[PDB]
Amino acid sequence: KASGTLREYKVVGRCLPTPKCRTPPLYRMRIFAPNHVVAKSRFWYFVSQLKKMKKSSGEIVYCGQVFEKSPLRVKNFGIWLRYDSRSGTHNMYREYRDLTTAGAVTQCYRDMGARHRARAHSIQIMKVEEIAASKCRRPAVKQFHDSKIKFPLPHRVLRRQHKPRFTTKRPNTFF
Amino acid sequence: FYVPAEPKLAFVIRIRGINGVSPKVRKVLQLLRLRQIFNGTFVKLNKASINMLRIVEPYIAWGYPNLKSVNELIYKRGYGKINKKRIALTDNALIARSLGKYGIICMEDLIHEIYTVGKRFKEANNFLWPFKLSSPRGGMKKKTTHFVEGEDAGNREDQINRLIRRMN
Amino acid sequence: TNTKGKRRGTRYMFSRPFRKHGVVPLATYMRIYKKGDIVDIKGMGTVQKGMPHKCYHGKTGRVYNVTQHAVGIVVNKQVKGKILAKRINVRIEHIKHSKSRDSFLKRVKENDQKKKEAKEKGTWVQLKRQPAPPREAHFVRTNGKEPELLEPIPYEFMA
Amino acid sequence: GVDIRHNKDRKVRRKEPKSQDIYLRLLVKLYRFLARRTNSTFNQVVLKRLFMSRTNRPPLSLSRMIRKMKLPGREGKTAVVVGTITDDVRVQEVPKLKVCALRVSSRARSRILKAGGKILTFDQLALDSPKGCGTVLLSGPRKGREVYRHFGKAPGTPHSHTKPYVRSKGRKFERARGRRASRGYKN
Amino acid sequence: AKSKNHTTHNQSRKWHRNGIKKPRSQRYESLKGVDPKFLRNMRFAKKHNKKGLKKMQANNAKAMAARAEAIKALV
RNA sequence: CGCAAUGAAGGUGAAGGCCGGCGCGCUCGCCGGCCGAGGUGGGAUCCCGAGGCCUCUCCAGUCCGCCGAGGGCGCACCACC
RNA sequence: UAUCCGGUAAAGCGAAUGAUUAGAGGUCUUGGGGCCGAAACGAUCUCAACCUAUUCUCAAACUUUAAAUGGGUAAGAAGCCCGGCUCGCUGGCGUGAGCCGGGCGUGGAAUGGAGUGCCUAGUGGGCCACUUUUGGUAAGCAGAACUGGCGCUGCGGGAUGAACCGAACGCCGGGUUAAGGCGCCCGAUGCCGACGCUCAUCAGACCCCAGAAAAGGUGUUGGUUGAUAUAGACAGCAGGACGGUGGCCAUGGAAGUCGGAAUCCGCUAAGGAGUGUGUAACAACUCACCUGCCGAAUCAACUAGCCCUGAAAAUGGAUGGCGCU
RNA sequence: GAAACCUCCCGUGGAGCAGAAGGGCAAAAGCUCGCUUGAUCUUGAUUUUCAGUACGAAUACAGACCGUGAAAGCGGGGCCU
RNA sequence: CGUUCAUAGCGACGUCGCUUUUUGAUCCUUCGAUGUCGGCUCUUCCUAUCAUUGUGAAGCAGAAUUCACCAAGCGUUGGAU
RNA sequence: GUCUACGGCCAUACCACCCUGAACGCGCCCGAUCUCGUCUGAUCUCGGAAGCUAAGCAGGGUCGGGCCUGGUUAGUACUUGGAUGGGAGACCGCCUGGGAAUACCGGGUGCUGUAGGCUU
């Protein structure tokens, strides 16, 4: 895999039926992926690690997007992981604070890139769970649990640095 | 759940060029009529066709076209293969002349057969000359790798139309 | 450089497989090869008289002669860049009827049956073989129970 | 780029004859035309035979030609041969024919006409029958040249019946080590 | 001055330039190397086929006449 | 030089068939008549050709083509006997 | 799509061959050495080889198993199916082969015009790469497999370069791309691009590639697992740290303190038959449990990202350069 | 007496088959007897190295003449390399 | 080991490195020739620091001294064979 | 139900011990005149038919060994093809398709041709 911004996909699939299994059991997976074509690949990869079930043995029954039913809320996601190291694999549990499960998943991947130089193919998302204000462990997130939350905007470095490339005025960063 | 049909027909594009190519690849690619880079064909899927399209995964991009994609290819870039000379399908009386035995008598009939994969698909399609597409406007994500891992190669099923737009 | 001896490197080739040593079971002999019969050659340790050369093991061919207890049996042999059809006398023991052909014939017989029939009827039937097609549209009913979720599972170092 | 071998993309047949004898080129002018404006494959062939080498359009014997028209079907029919007719002194009874060839050697000519035959040139053949309707287009044996006895699988290579090139046959020019099994071996 | 001892590197590619032709098939292949007794006998069977001709000709005429009677009964 | 070869040499040296009769038709020996370079597959080409396809009308109806289902004689060359 | 072949990766060694650890169980056998025995398969150990179930780890020249990739056939008219002749072969009659004569047409996908014969030049120093692989500590070393390159070959990129990555060349106009790029050198980010991480008195800065390791770091940033704790902590200072007891072995002296087997009880609020320091040996000092001030959170062990330590060469010097935080 | 010879039982071969190893082999390809010279006379074909030339080596047949066995058969050198 | 005490100074059993002032491997470059050893003279560069500067360490009381840092500024000598 | 003779496939048929075997068979069995062969009528050969299923043989039994066939092992190990993926290397992760073998746990434990018997 790679990225861009992920979505959620509900893939479901079954080992396709034989004489010896006339109505095989469907399976479902929260895939997070930049598009349905890869979602489905990703689905298989996971299924096969779990069940004896390869793409050629099976079919994907229903792959489709899953939209955030609470977009305009802001939520704290816990999110459990299983990345790889330059050494051996680890598990983690990180927390993000976002408007959409996708958003938080993407916002995870990026972080893992930064904090651990973990590429996507290295990473497995095992669950993403919206959470209460409480239950949140990470004080990164918990500093945004406040009702009278206030902060200034301090050394507010200018952009538009080349609009006026040259000029009279030295700028001003206090706002 | 309505599991719909697996696709009958896919369009296939050689996306990488003609040096250093492995010997088994090259054979297959020339069975597909993809001897220049950026040529493309319609390929009726079936186990036999599919396993060939696997063996050239890294060289081709391919997928299941739209209807529109068929039209946009066939009107704009569709040339008959008539007495082995490549010939622009300017008028119907060229299609008919060579596929009339098959009840294919006009531009429209040819598309029909390509798109639905009728009985005569083999001979209608054969008769079309391998689609000399342009280089893709807006370029490619990565020529090397598979679609799924951020590239352009391999099967991208639906998306292949997006590519057909920028390259027709 | 290597030795050009005849049997070289047939330690596991001409080697009677595990618990199949000993007497050559008679059927082997009492079954009949005519001219035009297709045969897959396969060496056998026990019978040495008339053992075929190692290049022709697995290789498969047609029978052009039949002596008292042997068969001359045309085979192909790629030599660098020029396949030679060539003819080797093999004792029966190192030889089996190929079944490659049987399945074609079975299908011919089936066509000639289905040609005689469905002529008087009028309906022309699909005789040709046709490749394994795209797997059709269909419904999947998930009666009642919803499909099962599959969480990917945590790593833990086993050993 | 485009993968094709250009190895075998030019074809090597003759278009025109390599000869510069004006009367052959005239014939060709006639048959080139006839072989386009008509359908008569005959003309296509006749024309194709007019571009070949003297080796490649070999002399038809009167005797062979006699025996090819006797054949049951082509009675009241014209022979055609894009090389030459020769005599056969080892044939006696000579039927009356109707022939076309570029040449009919003097002896063979006499024989044909004495017997009440007929001899035609090609430009005559074209007027008569511009579609080659009513013809038996024959040929001399292509493989008659001694040359061919030397080609094949090389001699001294088992089961090669291949005349070797030797200055002068006889006891002591080849026929030792390699043929006498007594001496060395044999093939 | 030691030197390369052997290889097969470009060899494939040469072979395939001109084809690797599967050796040319024919109906009516030779009887070279066929258990002599067999051959003799068949040569003899061949020798005396012309004897037992008049019988065969006659038999084929009766078969042809039976075909014509069968085609007349059909029509 | 070519139209004859083969064998170390002495030397020998390229036809066969059929039919009828006579010798026991003995797949052998001798006498009359006829044909005369054998056969199988493939083979460019030629030939025959049911049949259509129309003609400003309903039929009759020779002429000209176009194609031709199907069948033939089959060069050269190849494979084989 | 049918159908054979195979003994490589893997696996196996409670299956053969070989190799090999350990305990259980066995006077199997017997021994050689013992101790208690005159001696005794008596008792007691022992080590030898052998055995019964087990167990540790192996094989290029082992193997029951056994892939992937791979090599053969076959997928029709030279085929099917009837009728009759020939044979000096074979044979109770029959086989089998050979001959005639008729009857039946598309027989998996995709692609492609095939077949065939002469004459024939150069060549027969090679090298490079992925993967496989032998030699060797290695090598820009030697030698093999596979494909593809270079050699014969320019072009964009990799600053530079045989062989990398892209792509393969008639002469040009427009458009588009690949691979790589876009402070400036230098075409293009002069986007109000997004999220992190990171400061180096040796920063880093992109396939082939031209440079570093083990081991460390309260530098920082993430994780993982345990802990702690208003029953009053954590640190910080303050108070005590004993008795049975020179405890047993060791004397050369070890009363906690060169070492080693021990390693419990009392009083307990609580103190180890004792962390050290120091003693010839003690003594003396030092290191839990609890309080007072104090007053809510706090600590440990792992792990991985960037940074640092580890890190030394000779003309002055090279993320291509300038420079960049 | 650990070893002599006798007897019974177990024994997939752990022996033996001239030699290196690998294959193969149990009413045998081992051992023991009996008779014997197929290790003889001769056309070609084919495999193996291969250039698909030789040599050597081998594989099928065919015709002689013999051996052996009740016979089927087997044998024209050494179980095979 | 160092009275004692692992690490003042040492460091076995093991292990990871750098260097090209050793020697090997190698055979790319040069055989229509790059003058083949030393010493002499002269310059410069390196640091892996003997001395001197400024420093941390000791089993540094002083004296002598090792161990380590910054450090290549300046020196590093005359003779017998 | 089942046997004998000649068999095919060659353990689902082998090995070990246990029970049960009607009728026909097949056996052991009792003899050495002849045939034939031994140190020995044990084997072999021959002539028999008083006994007997003890044995062979057959059928079954056994939380039996073995063999047979499933599951698990495990989508594990491996592996085709791919990337200017990672990693100082050792190696690893991914994409694309292919995919094993033990230990372990279940089930199975001869089928069958030709000819001729018995149970009439």
Ligand SMILES: [Mg+2]
């Ligand atoms: Mg390339």
Ligand SMILES: [Mg+2]
């Ligand atoms: Mg070299």
Ligand SMILES: [Mg+2]
């Ligand atoms: Mg050489």
Ligand SMILES: [Mg+2]
């Ligand atoms: Mg091997």
Ligand SMILES: [Mg+2]
């Ligand atoms: Mg292994």
Ligand SMILES: [Mg+2]
């Ligand atoms: Mg050169």
Ligand SMILES: [Mg+2]
């Ligand atoms: Mg015997």
Ligand SMILES: [Mg+2]
């Ligand atoms: Mg004989």
Ligand SMILES: [Mg+2]
């Ligand atoms: Mg012997």
Ligand SMILES: [Mg+2]
């Ligand atoms: Mg000490």
Ligand SMILES: [Mg+2]
């Ligand atoms: Mg100089």
Ligand SMILES: [Mg+2]
């Ligand atoms: Mg220094």
Ligand SMILES: [Mg+2]
């Ligand atoms: Mg007795």
Ligand SMILES: [Mg+2]
């Ligand atoms: Mg019994």
Ligand SMILES: [Mg+2]
């Ligand atoms: Mg009993």
Ligand SMILES: [Mg+2]
């Ligand atoms: Mg069992």
